[PDB]
Design a protein around this ligand. Structure first.
Ligand SMILES: [Ca+2]
Ligand SMILES: [Ca+2]
Ligand SMILES: [Ca+2]
Ligand SMILES: [Ca+2]
Ligand SMILES: [Ca+2]
Ligand SMILES: [Ca+2]
Ligand SMILES: [Ca+2]
Ligand SMILES: [Ca+2]
Lengths: 352, 144, 352, 144, 352, 352, 144, 144
């Protein structure tokens, strides 16, 4: 039972300095395969590529097929993937779909191309997808999707504004110069589509230099538009950057992992209690020591306790904030005032 | 649901012995100690201030009904309770040691007793040392 | 009375998954109309566009006219737009002005062009404005205007600095090379306006490559200016980005919506009280239980209470900050010290 | 305005029974309890510290006049008071339930009484269930 | 005495909506003068410019000379510029130096050019400096200089790194291709200076397209360098942007202006007291009620009080921070514990 | 013993205004040497450079050799470099390796080139490394490496995403146009490598303009890719910028340097105590006043005290945070409640 | 300076009546009340904790000398004290109303008395209502 | 290590005089005062809450063993203790004044005594005034 867990932590959850090297080696192998896919197009180094890349594709199909058949077992180690339908639920994960696709399709193409043809025409693209075969847990995509999902409103606003400005400025430009001939004998803004091409080239601060306005009106429009709008299509870079920076700033204000054990234990306890009460023949009633008109009050106290425990738990996972202090002080001052009141009552009892 | 509303009204009447249209921390502490629980003066407020959505500090009948009617069997509750197991899991393989479970359940937080724990385990899948799949727990306790 | 509210929440305040689809469909229709406005300029696909876009303009005029006549009624649901003058106050909103303009003007142009002419010359621009017909509540523009209004000083500073540097560097360049011939037979910086063109092209990091200095002095000036000033005209992107990021960071520190009900109720109560006191025959005086020299002190206590309630309310809408804690602690310690002082006084009374 | 300043001076003299040129929390609590209000020791400071612009903790005649003369009938006050209604509005259509209004006004914050509320409603537009346009309220209470 | 203050608040400290318009008008006049300086270079519109700009220069010299002679008086209103040497200390301020320079130099050039010559050759640059005559108090430059002075270390680091990378990559490029001919008959990287030109053009993401490497080694070096280093020379934009954003975030956490009056009054009082004690015949000793061996302890208590008051003041100007809370709580708990201890002592006295 | 410390603070730890000038002079000398290395390539100013730079190299070798021999002594001042092996451990520091390399290699090349040859071919690169001879303590590299090490995850994510998008879009482009001829007679995307060149030129917003797609499909792909991905390869600029800004924001919330002396003294004291206890014949046992069954409890109390002191110290170096307040309040309220409980017990004793 | 160090040592001896090599809040409160000042228990700590650079809570002879020797007549002190006038200045023209000055000086913060204030004004430039150039004050009180 | 675990169990038994499977602040304060230390009520919690990794507030046998077994002789401990010397170093040349060391060690923090300090110095390198290389200290106290 240890073999499976070890191999799974080796293939799926990489940690240490004896598996990072293996993954880096696999990645470098994929990179070499890509590079040899590149040279297949060079007219000079053609005949060598079509053979070396073919043999590399063979060996890589073997390697990845074996690794996948294995990872369909290590993943069988876990408990949510156990069983036949379990492993089926593992091959449903996106990355597994991708891996199966790539492996089987490479096999098919290769065995169909045995006898520079459509074989390579397709392998040139198959060898590209394997670049996704490096990140297993998919932390990168998760992080990016989350940070984008938090800032959806601002990005929508920015893109809308930029696209609107692009449309309007491009049409105005096209209107200002649809007949002014280039320095050479070639009218440039013959259409509106070419104008939109120029606009998308400009607004992103690329400037290929193929389309440049001629009439001074067009130059004025271009100057104003470049001054105004480029600070929009290049803005999302600042939003996501600052978002990543702030979210990293959070990661240094996380509570000690030990500081959330009691909350979780209490949550589990109360959640079980709220279920064992539905069975009146249970033994949980032994905590209060037959009783007929007292069942409902207990049944509701259990629910209140479950809700407050869930709140205290979901609060013990977020970082330190001002709500923590502004609630803790109130709680402590409440306790202290209650103590003073009790002492006052006892002293008035004694004197009186 | 008529019968449901009337039963919750009977419950509210049993809670509020005082003649009024609300519930305060005093009445709740009274009904609590009536059973022999000996609570503090802060957990009572923690109970109360999480049931009323008006910041009023007291519970009205509509807020009490909103709470009691809140279906606590959903995907959010199931996810939270499932997440609160993985703190007690080494290797995250979804398997807890029966002995480790007994200890962490009897000794921490709101302390259970021998009978309750011995009942909770006997109603689950116990193969051997470990192999206590808490997925079975989260599914048996989140099936309404 | 429910029909109007439902249709209004359907057209003006979109929520759910059964109206987002309708709005997305309208937007895609507008996009298809735009695309067919584009192909009207292509010399190849000309005769098809001038007909398909014409019929699409007809149907879209029908659709948007009907939708507007409806939205002038759903908006009649509300209370600040009710009545004739009310609905008139609704057609005054900018977006409504735009919508009426577009609809009626499309109708006019179309019915005037019946018998590739000025008709299309104008529709090519009319079909552009409808891109504004997607965002109803105008949240995007509101957000952007607010975040710009907060950072007005910094943006003014940056733009001023950048424009000054542009002017100076462009003039220095023009001075350094007004006679150096291009590699080809065409003097480039024949004027000062061409120099400013080059400057606006450079400073925004576009670089069309049409105007490039020749003399080494000009190259030195260009190097220094590009190194120094581009970090100014591309700076506003960072300012607004970080501002959006921080403002989003605020949105996760908002008080529970329930935590501001009592403040609002108290504000309303005291504000009414400060008005019912102006009527000495009112019944609000029954709260103190004829009285001649006591009217003024009450009339001023009411004002003090109104002001403090308004303060406590306007404070219950901003997010959690340090003022909250630094005031709450003072208040609580004040209460506690007062309690201790009362107990000390009572005990000195008892012993003495 | 001469008469205005003299009347506010008479009011200040009525407030400051003690011979001095200021007002402290003690005198204000005294004049408050003189009417039978039973205030706390924190709301008094909340009243005071929002009237003086010197952080001195006590009110001088010029600050008292600056406050009393502050025209509370303007666009900012009207906007704030209007915004504080929309918390009690479902669908934001500017219509409050007469019963909902009575309840939220009698039961929350500084509790009014039956007579005051019954007077506030009778001086507004009440068509039927709901239809209590609070625009009428905000305009009748912000007309000086 | 009110005329001078009014005119000074009109010219130096602009506020309201009746002077912003005047300043905007002056700025637009300067802009029109600039534009007519531009058209002086256009060969088409030459003869008109040399006359209209000449007359505009005359009238603007008159206007600005009069305004300066006035502003040398309104500034005489204040107390740190009063007197002859005072006003002299006002004409020393940088902006005043600039204004005098521009005015007198325009006068000189104009009266020397009366009889398209060096006159205009110099006025073309004189009309540029007046763009600095818009911001009076110099808030923009102050803000920018401060925010740069806070982040000196990071900017130095970034510029050093970028310059080093530029040097190295440019030399490597020059080494990789010093003989590969262009597509046309013109060797491009004939020197090292041209290589540095290409490097400064690339690293700032301009890309004029005049110099592009040819040999694949150069293309590899260029790809790597563009991927790595451009995130350095374009980085300062992010630093200063986020700095401005954060500093604006501070401006919404400033203490109420009234909350710093008592601190200042106490500072002034104690600072005077520490000076009146040096005069033993003074009257400040009447605060303790001859005394010979008690002078020194008082003389040192005064110094301690002055220092603590200065600290409490300099703390009452910075925004709210965590030091405020973490000190206030300690102070309050100290007071409370002292009170409890006093009560305990009194009760032990009574019982004992 | 003061001479060595003074010279070391002069060469290694610069402070003041009498050594910054010396370092700036050395840097300007290195810059002049670089500039004269540049002109060695210009065909016009060739014969002058090869002599002036040669003599400057001689004198600079002398200067830097002497300075290094000295700095191998001033560094001998310190205590971790003292002794022969000590100084050897100083010449191991990277910057010292660089300095020795440069000096000795310049000497070798120069003395080998005495009799425009390989001599200059190598000196042209040797004179480049000395740009690293300006920053002694290496604070810049330390800062940059740290701030990058904090944000490793985000940068890895961004680079991975950008590289993947680059690969895919470049291949799609190459597929869309591998036969469309340029406006001139030269097929552009003859290969896949040229496509990757175009992609790396575009994605970094340079746009040399040498390779521009032709077929409308390629233009669509280019528009979409430029709109989407450039916000990734230009994103790291925002991340590191905001990180630097926030880290600078920290530098204004550092505790007073005096506030960490007692913590350090206590740490040192307890750490020594935990060592003197291992020697039972020591005198530290005199702090408890033979004892046989009491050794172990003391031996463990010492360890507990050492750990808590180390915690309190490592906490007295980080800036002010919310953990400080949320712990200090708990501690103070605990003390206060304990005091109240003691008073209650004593009063119940007295009354009872 | 030998005489300076010896005089400061005599002062330290006069402060620390207790036989020791330090000064605590108790001795300072004792010597304060010995003159009839009636200070609090927090301003004493505020005095102390701003003189010692060791966080020790007590003052040693070297820290006391570092403080007493600190030349408080420099550009930073002059700038701070000058800035603390502009809060009492309308129009920022560097002119304070003699009456406004008297009031703000007698009534706020550490309250002076009639004699001290009347002496502070008589030693400055008083032209008429206002015209009290506080530059003269800041220069007369920052000349060592 | 069997003998190690058994000796730590004997130590735990000596600590927990009460019959139980844990240690509370009461027992630790008792065993502390049993030696004549007179600790506070906060340093006890500071000791305890830094030894248990469960937030339970009490120490269990496994946590106590995890702590006692933690090798405090490593590179992190050596680095921290070395860094805590450079606060007492002028010019950072790694040389402390023997007199300055004696003073700062006897007078601050947990006050040592004459004998302990005189022993700590006699077991190091003392050349003359200064020259007390604290590298020798950090190496003699971090050699296990
Ligand atoms: Ca009740
Ligand atoms: Ca309520
Ligand atoms: Ca009074
Ligand atoms: Ca006051
Ligand atoms: Ca003493
Ligand atoms: Ca001290
Ligand atoms: Ca025990
Ligand atoms: Ca524990």
């Amino acid at each position: 039972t240890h073999v499976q867990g070890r191999v799974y932590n080796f293939l799926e959850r990489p940690t240490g300095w004896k598996c990072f090297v293996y993954h880096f080696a696999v990645f470098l192998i994929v990179l070499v395969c890509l590079i040899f896919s590149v040279l297949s197009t060079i007219e000079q180094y053609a005949a060598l590529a079509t053979g070396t890349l073919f043999w590399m594709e063979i060996v890589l199909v073997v390697f990845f097929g074996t690794e996948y058949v294995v990872r369909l077992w290590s993943a069988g180690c876990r408990s949510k993937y156990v069983g036949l339908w379990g492993r089926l639920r593992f091959a449903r994960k996106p990355i597994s779909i991708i891996d199966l696709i790539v492996v089987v399709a490479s096999m098919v193409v290769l065995c169909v191309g045995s006898k520079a043809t459509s074989a390579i025409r397709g392998i040139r693209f198959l060898q590209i997808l394997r670049m996704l075969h490096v990140d297993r847990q998919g932390g990168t995509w998760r992080l990016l999707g989350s940070v984008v999902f938090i800032h959806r409103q601002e990005l929508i606003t920015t893109l809308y504004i930029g696209f609107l400005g692009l449309i309007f400025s491009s049409y105005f430009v096209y209107l200002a110069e649809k007949d002014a001939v280039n320095e050479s004998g070639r009218v440039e803004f013959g259409s509106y589509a070419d104008a939109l091409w120029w606009g998308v080239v400009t607004v992103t601060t690329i400037g290929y230099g193929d389309k440049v306005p001629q009439t001074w009106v067009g130059k004025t429009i271009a100057s104003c538009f470049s001054v105004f709008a480029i600070s929009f299509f290049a803005l999302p870079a600042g939003i996501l950057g600052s978002g990543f920076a702030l979210k990293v700033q959070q990661k240094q204000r996380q509570k000690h992992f030990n500081r959330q054990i009691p909350a979780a234990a209490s949550l589990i306890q109360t959640a079980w209690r709220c279920y064992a009460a539905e069975n009146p023949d249970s033994s949980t009633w032994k905590i209060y020591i037959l009783r007929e008109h007292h069942r409902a009050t207990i049944k509701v106290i259990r629910r209140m306790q479950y809700f407050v425990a869930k709140k205290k738990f979901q609060q013990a996972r977020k970082p330190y904030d001002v709500r923590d202090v502004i609630e803790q002080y109130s709680q402590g001052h409440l306790n202290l005032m209650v103590r003073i009141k009790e002492l006052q009552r006892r002293l008035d009892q004694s004197i009186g | 649901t008529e019968e449901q509303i009337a039963e919750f009204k009977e419950a509210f009447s049993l809670f509020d012995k005082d003649g009024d249209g609300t519930i305060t921390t005093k009445e709740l502490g009274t009904v609590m100690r009536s059973l022999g629980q000996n609570p503090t003066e802060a957990e009572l407020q923690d109970m109360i201030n999480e049931v009323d959505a008006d910041g009023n500090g007291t519970i009205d009948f509509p807020e009490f009904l909103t709470m009691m009617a809140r279906k606590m069997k959903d995907t959010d509750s199931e996810e939270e309770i499932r997440e609160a197991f993985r703190v007690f899991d080494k290797d995250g393989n979804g398997y807890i040691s029966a002995a480790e479970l007994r200890h962490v359940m009897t000794n921490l937080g709101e302390k259970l007793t021998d009978e309750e724990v011995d009942e909770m385990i006997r109603e689950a899948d116990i193969d051997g040392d470990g192999q206590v799949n808490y997925e079975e727990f989260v599914q048996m306790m989140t099936a309404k």
